Amino acid sequence: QPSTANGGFPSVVVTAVTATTSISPDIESTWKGLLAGESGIHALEDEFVTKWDLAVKIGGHLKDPVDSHMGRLDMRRMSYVQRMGKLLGGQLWESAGSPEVDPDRFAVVVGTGLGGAERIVESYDLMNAGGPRKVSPLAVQMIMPNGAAAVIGLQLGARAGVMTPVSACSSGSEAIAHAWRQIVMGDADVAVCGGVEGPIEALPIAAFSMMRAMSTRNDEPERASRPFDKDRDGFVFGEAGALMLIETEEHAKARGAKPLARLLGAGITSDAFHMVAPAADGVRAGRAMTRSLELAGLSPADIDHVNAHGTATPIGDAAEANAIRVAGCDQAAVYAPKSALGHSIGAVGALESVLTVLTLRDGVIPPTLNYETPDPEIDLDVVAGEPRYGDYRYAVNNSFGFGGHNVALAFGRY
Amino acid sequence: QPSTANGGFPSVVVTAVTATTSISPDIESTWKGLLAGESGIHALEDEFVTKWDLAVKIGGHLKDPVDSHMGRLDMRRMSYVQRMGKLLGGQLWESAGSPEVDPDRFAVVVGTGLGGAERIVESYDLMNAGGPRKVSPLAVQMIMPNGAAAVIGLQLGARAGVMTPVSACSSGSEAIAHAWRQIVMGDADVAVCGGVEGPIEALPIAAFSMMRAMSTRNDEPERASRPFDKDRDGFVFGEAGALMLIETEEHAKARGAKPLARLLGAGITSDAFHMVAPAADGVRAGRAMTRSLELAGLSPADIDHVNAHGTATPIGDAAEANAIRVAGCDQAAVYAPKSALGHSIGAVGALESVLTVLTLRDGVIPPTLNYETPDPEIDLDVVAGEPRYGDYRYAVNNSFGFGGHNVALAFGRY
Numbered sequence A, B: 001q002p003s004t005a006n007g008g009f010p011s012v013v014v015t016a017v018t019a020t021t022s023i024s025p026d027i028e029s030t031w032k033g034l035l036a037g038e039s040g041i042h043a044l045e046d047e048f049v050t051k052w053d054l055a056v057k058i059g060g061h062l063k064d065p066v067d068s069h070m071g072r073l074d075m076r077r078m079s080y081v082q083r084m085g086k087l088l089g090g091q092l093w094e095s096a097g098s099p100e101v102d103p104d105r106f107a108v109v110v111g112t113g114l115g116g117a118e119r120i121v122e123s124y125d126l127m128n129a130g131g132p133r134k135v136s137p138l139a140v141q142m143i144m145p146n147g148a149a150a151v152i153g154l155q156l157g158a159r160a161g162v163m164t165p166v167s168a169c170s171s172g173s174e175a176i177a178h179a180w181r182q183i184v185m186g187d188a189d190v191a192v193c194g195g196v197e198g199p200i201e202a203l204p205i206a207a208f209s210m211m212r213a214m215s216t217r218n219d220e221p222e223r224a225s226r227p228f229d230k231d232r233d234g235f236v237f238g239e240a241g242a243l244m245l246i247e248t249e250e251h252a253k254a255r256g257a258k259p260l261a262r263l264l265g266a267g268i269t270s271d272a273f274h275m276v277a278p279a280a281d282g283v284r285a286g287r288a289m290t291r292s293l294e295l296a297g298l299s300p301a302d303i304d305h306v307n308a309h310g311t312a313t314p315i316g317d318a319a320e321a322n323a324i325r326v327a328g329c330d331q332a333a334v335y336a337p338k339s340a341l342g343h344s345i346g347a348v349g350a351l352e353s354v355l356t357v358l359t360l361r362d363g364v365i366p367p368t369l370n371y372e373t374p375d376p377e378i379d380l381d382v383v384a385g386e387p388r389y390g391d392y393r394y395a396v397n398n399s400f401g402f403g404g405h406n407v408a409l410a411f412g413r414y
């Protein structure tokens, strides 16, 4: 039976990471801000909140907006997520030394929650006003939700596959999972993978808050996102995009790249329970964690750290607590980064994967913000108060998205 | 080195197929219509063609509309592709004997070109008219492009993974590719896979026809789609959805299921050349065919049949002819089903996979319609005039979608 530990799968390592965040456009500055207890969630000064009088008035816009890095050409040639993907794709490649890889062994897997939706309603109005010939010949390549991954593959020259998984909150983690599969199956030796997502706007807020899924603690924005806390209220939006560079260890050593961590395995299961709510028993979500251990060659005892999905909805954290217990990783140190960075849907799984890698690299877990009164039903060892320095050897990043999509990524210290 | 032929991968077989089509809502009636030279492409009697005076006035609506099978509940609870997915999901399961499988070994992989887009502009207007509280709590689960696969997994009880690949015209084939991967890697023993796509409307027509990509031969609708013909004019829309049931051969024999064909391998590459146009040399597209042979254990000589992508654009068919030659399958008998069924984007790769399976089962290839004057630059053995009965043992289905996404599925007679 093949596994990473017994050589059945080639060793895959992470060699570069990049992310834009409500705390910082630089991933290393975001890391240091998280360690200092910073939060990216503030009061929304956007005019659409006062216009429609939204139930939620809090959220985290990117510290550095994507369009401040975009000229007129990009503003009409690409959708938002494509523009975010081009920005992150370029920053990731330079951060990795701008290597020259074999294009036929180079893949791209970038997930997203929805895609270039704003370009559909724009083309809707552009033809209602002037007719069918007033729709741009570039409209198809902007609207298609594979567009972000397509521009990244074209910009970097990836010819071993350009793929876009879609599974809401797990899209970014699932992208890293499939990129790992594309490598261990022999189709590629190096891959850019992650997730991108659109900005906070009025319609996304209205749709999610009508599910009673979002926190409404508008008086203290930095204290609204309270994963595993008894005063839970729901999740808070926090914009993000994130990409990582993974490659076989053989490929990394031959180019002189210093690996940040090891990508050991990936488990994908599904609940088949409800269209938006997770299964309370957490059985299938836990099986995804178990499956990532099986492919990696680990046991629950080896898991020192779990980067939780932790959206801070009442039923979400309760289900994940059961899932962690079902997987047998209840003794692990748990971090819920959505306490500080919020929820970025199609990108957050990729962002939290980057944070998992940094935790294994520096041997430190940032504190879960606003964890002050532990929920009696959730008995987990969550890091809080200050960063916890520890000897973390293996970690699992969880992402359980709407629709019942469970992705677990098993990571190891290099 | 693992392969299907040398036992490195478990044997995977196709046990049931279902499709709705511009010719028939029944896949067996569609097959018989194709063999009799029927076409689903007619003059569009929709009022939006006269309203905007579209350059194209031809296309193939479904013979049996999806919403004629939908009550009021489904018309507000689901988007179009979700409704198509529920219809096809239910028909496929009954056609397979309604088996009772282990939910933890059952996966669903359903691709789509875009998703529930019509529900975004609907929620856009619903809040402009009444405010944020007038957006349905079901809006999120209708809009998310993973929605069709989500309702199919929930309806049939698939708990080993519910996934949605997005890659334009190759989405439906890529879904079958990932479902094959999910099985040969040990994560599942049975999978429902295919693709769904929305109907023909004015905006899709305007966007694609402004790329000069669509045929404008409105006087003879049944003769507009002319793949590999010298009088090529572009592609024609033809609505479709298709699903197939695949499972390990061990799993099929233990339940008494008669396999229709074997799914032997799948190759995914990318061009990284242009956002909508395929590479002229067809090198990466041919490598996807080669890769499916490598995983299957075949050589170009074993390929008797190629179900071509064949959109009938001038540059598309020229690039695929080079791709087939690059892969070394130039002596194979080529079928271009878009000549009769048109192009259904996210679903067509799944539909043409079903047609490939039926070709191997019945030993017959339908004629490529409107192939009357062979393009001098495309020297391929395309089936034309009447069905060609032959001893086809192995076939490859091609799907090269916009964005440079190349998927090749290698199929074998059971």
Ligand SMILES: Cc1n[nH]c2ccc(NS(=O)(=O)CCCCF)cc12
Binding pocket: A080, A081, A113, A114, A115, A116, A117, A118, A197, A198, A199, A200, A201, A204, A237, A238, A239, A240, A343, A344, A345
């Ligand atoms: C707005 C918008 N314009 N274009 C988009 C494309 C995708 C999404 N996705 S989203 O979930 O609604 C945003 C929530 C993430 C908050 F950090 C939104 C938009």
Ligand SMILES: Cc1n[nH]c2ccc(NS(=O)(=O)CCCCF)cc12
Binding pocket: B080, B081, B113, B114, B115, B116, B117, B118, B197, B198, B199, B200, B201, B204, B237, B238, B239, B240, B343, B344, B345
């Ligand atoms: C319209 C519509 N409403 N909802 C949709 C969801 C997806 C798509 N896809 S499409 O490419 O534009 C249709 C082209 C296929 C022709 F057979 C269209 C719609």
Ligand code: NA
Binding pocket: A307, A308, A309, A310, A352, A397, A398, A399
């Ligand atoms: Na996590």
Ligand code: NA
Binding pocket: B307, B308, B309, B310, B352, B397, B398, B399
């Ligand atoms: Na084909």
